[PDB]
UniProtKB/Swiss-Prot annotation:
The gene is OTUB2. It catalyses: Thiol-dependent hydrolysis of ester, thioester, amide, peptide and isopeptide bonds formed by the C-terminal Gly of ubiquitin (a 76-residue protein attached to proteins as an intracellular targeting signal). This is Ubiquitin thioesterase OTUB2. GO terms for cellular component: nucleus. In the structure described by PubMed:15258613, the Asp-43 active site of the catalytic triad is located too far to interact directly with the active site His-219. A possible explanation is that OTUB2 is in inactive conformation in absence of ubiquitin and a conformation change may move Asp-43 in the proximity of His-219 in presence of ubiquitin substrate. Transmembrane segments: none annotated. The record marks 221 as: Required to orient and stabilize the active site H-224. Widely expressed. Expressed at higher level in brain. Keywords: Hydrolase, Protease, Thiol protease, Ubl conjugation pathway. The lineage of its organism: Eukaryota, Metazoa, Chordata, Craniata, Vertebrata. PROSITE patterns: OTU.
């Protein structure tokens, strides 16, 4: 369990910032709304890895929602092709992602899903897929991302440098894009070391979340309501 941990009590993470007043206050507050946490490896891939694992875990045993998600996943090659990715270069990553969606459907266990996400090869192929899908979604909607995020940004260069490569850290653009690309509602809790309110954001605004993440020290861990 070196990429995604077993479930732990939320206050187990106090030991990560011992004798730190502000972190202790915010983790204690967080423990009022959330009961448990899973830790993810801090390797630069943890947003993709955590969203992928937590969303698929949220589907287990839900036959309608699995059917709908599979229907969307089967269309994602078209998104990739429309953005200029070549099928023979994305095939291995798409196949790995479709494989774990089928495991959610056929096997239906947390244990099986956690084993795939802790398999370095399967897990990294999944992350690479999610990165390419994020890139495709931004590229195909470049006007949207310029209008609403930043009119001055260079979309193609951003995707090439800060989305597609493994180990590249995320910002709110990648979160919004991957949430929209897979129709995943997620809530991010923000814990920094400033003497400020614990606060969160829901991607997109309207929505009931499937996934809750804790963002702290440039890192995403998985929360349980």
């Amino acid at each position: 369990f070196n990429l995604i941990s077993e479930k732990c009590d939320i206050l187990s993470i106090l030991r990560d910032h011992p004798e730190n007043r502000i972190y202790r206050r915010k983790i204690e507050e967080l423990s009022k709304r959330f009961t448990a946490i899973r830790k993810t490896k801090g390797d630069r891939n943890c947003f993709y890895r955590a969203l992928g694992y937590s969303y698929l875990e949220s589907l287990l045993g839900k036959s309608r929602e699995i059917f709908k998600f599979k229907e969307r996943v089967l269309q994602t090659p078209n998104d990739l092709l429309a953005a200029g990715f070549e099928e023979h270069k994305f095939r291995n990553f798409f196949n790995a992602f479709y494989s774990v969606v089928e495991l959610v459907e056929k096997d239906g266990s947390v244990s099986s899903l956690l084993k795939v996400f802790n398999d370095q090869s399967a897990s990294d192929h999944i992350v690479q897929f999610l990165r390419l899908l994020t890139s495709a979604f931004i590229r195909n909607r470049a006007d949207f991302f310029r209008h609403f995020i930043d009119e001055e940004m260079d979309i193609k260069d951003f995707c090439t440098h800060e989305v597609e490569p493994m180990a590249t850290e995320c910002d709110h653009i990648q979160i919004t894009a991957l949430s929209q690309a897979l129709s995943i509602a997620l809530q991010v809790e923000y814990v920094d070391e400033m003497d400020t309110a614990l606060n969160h954001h829901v991607f997109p605004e309207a929505a009931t979340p499937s996934v809750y993440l804790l963002y702290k020290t440039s890192h995403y861990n998985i929360l349980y309501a």
